[PDB]
Design a protein that fits this description.
By secondary structure, the chain is mainly beta. The chain has a single domain, classed as Immunoglobulin-like (Sandwich). Helix content is 0%, strand content 39%. It is built from no helices and seven strands. A four-stranded antiparallel β-sheet has the order 1-2-5-4, with no helix packed on it. Strands 3-6-7 form a three-stranded antiparallel β-sheet, with no helix packed on it. Strand 6 and strand 7 form a beta hairpin. The two termini are 20 Å apart. This is Envelope glycoprotein. It is found in: Host endoplasmic reticulum membrane; Virion membrane. GO terms for molecular function: protein dimerization activity. Its main location: host cell. It is classed as viral protein.
Length: 115
């Protein structure tokens, strides 16, 4: 399920220095827990993370549960666990902007993969 203000264009879409620490894992509460580390000393920017049902990142079907995805400071250099909402059947969790990205899958109660 999806709203505007939680995705919320609070700044321009950049991020540069992230790396995965923990790929998304379903909480059994309807959500996934996902962990990154922030691999640089810079980049106050609108962090591109998203939650969709078919890697249709072009129209967000889920949300970012933990926070509005925006890096408000250069001090964001943390190792940081974030919740997302992956919809039922399938989901795809995208981390990045055009030329610079990563993505991960999930499969939950009626997937194309049968779970």
């Amino acid at each position: 399920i999806s709203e505007f203000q939680l995705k919320g264009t609070t700044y321009g879409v950049c991020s540069k220095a992230f790396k995965f620490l923990g790929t998304p894992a379903d909480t059994g509460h309807g959500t996934v827990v996902l962990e990154l580390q922030y691999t640089g000393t810079d980049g106050p920017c609108k962090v591109p993370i998203s939650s969709v049902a078919s890697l249709n990142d072009l129209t967000p079907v889920g949300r970012l549960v933990t926070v509005n995805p925006f890096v408000s400071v250069a001090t964001a250099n943390a190792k940081v666990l974030i919740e997302l909402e992956p919809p039922f059947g399938d989901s795809y969790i995208v981390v990045g902007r055009g030329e610079q990205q990563i993505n991960h899958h999930w499969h939950k109660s009626g997937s194309s993969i049968g779970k």
